[PDB]
Amino acid sequence: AMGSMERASLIQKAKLAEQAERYEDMAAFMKGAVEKGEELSCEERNLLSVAYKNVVGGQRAAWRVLSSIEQKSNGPEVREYREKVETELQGVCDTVLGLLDSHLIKEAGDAESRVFYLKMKGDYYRYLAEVATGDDKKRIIDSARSAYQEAMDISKKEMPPTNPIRLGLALNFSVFHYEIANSPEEAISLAKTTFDEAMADLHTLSEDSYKDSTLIMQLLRDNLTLWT
């Protein structure tokens, strides 16, 4: 549906939708922009990520509310409506995964872009995993793992330990280990090593970069406090 709108107008409208807190519109504008076929700049990758994280965040919050109610119940209505919200969530995740596979990741050659998109691939498979069950759950969990691991391998080779994308990737992979993979020790080890290596590299940063890095290190510390 956004095929007739200029790329620059889609990006401008994504920014207006963010100001208006219209995240579904923001995601549709950014999907339109990706579908123009050109690579995304750093600012535009962040617009894509903010749009979809807010849309899926709403769906995840609702799914948790409904799943809770359903668990306590255990007519068909709660299960039906939880399944409706679940399907809509799966559709948003599949859309994002589709944009990454067609063709954002394959054209991303710089570390900052390739790590960003692989982290996104891990996060959306992780959201699919939260609602998955059984073996289905296993192949989805391994997809999330694989994407996070490739991103980590690149980030460790190509970025300093304070780089915010590297820090956020490590934060979310630690969450994957604690909440999805039933590996709390791996989660704690990852968050602690990430935190310690960033602290040792802070002396290299300007005031503004220091603020960016320490904000995410505080997220790692908040989890380590929750987990220990």
Ligand X SMILES: O=C(COc1ccccc1P(=O)(O)O)Nc1cccc(C(F)(F)F)c1
Range 72-111, binding its own copies (CB under 8 A)? 75, 77-78, 80-81, 84-85
- Residue 61 CB, nearest distance to its own copies (Å)? 7
Q: Which positions from 96 to 115 touch Cl ion by CB under 5 A, shown as an x/- string?
A: -------------x------
Cα angle, residue 62 at apex, residues 12 and 144 outer, rounded to 5°:
75
Among 49, 143, 155, 172, binds ligand X (CB under 6 A): 172
What, of Cl ion, ligand X, its own copies, none, does residue 65 touch, CB below 5 to 8 Å by kind? its own copies
- Residue 125 CB, nearest distance to ligand X (Å)? 12
- Residue 9 CB, nearest distance to Cl ion (Å)? 8
Range 22-61, binding its own copies (CB under 8 A)? 22, 25, 58, 61
Binding site for its own copies (CB under 8 A): 9, 12-13, 16-17, 19-22, 25, 58, 61-62, 65-66, 69, 75, 77-78, 80-81, 84-85
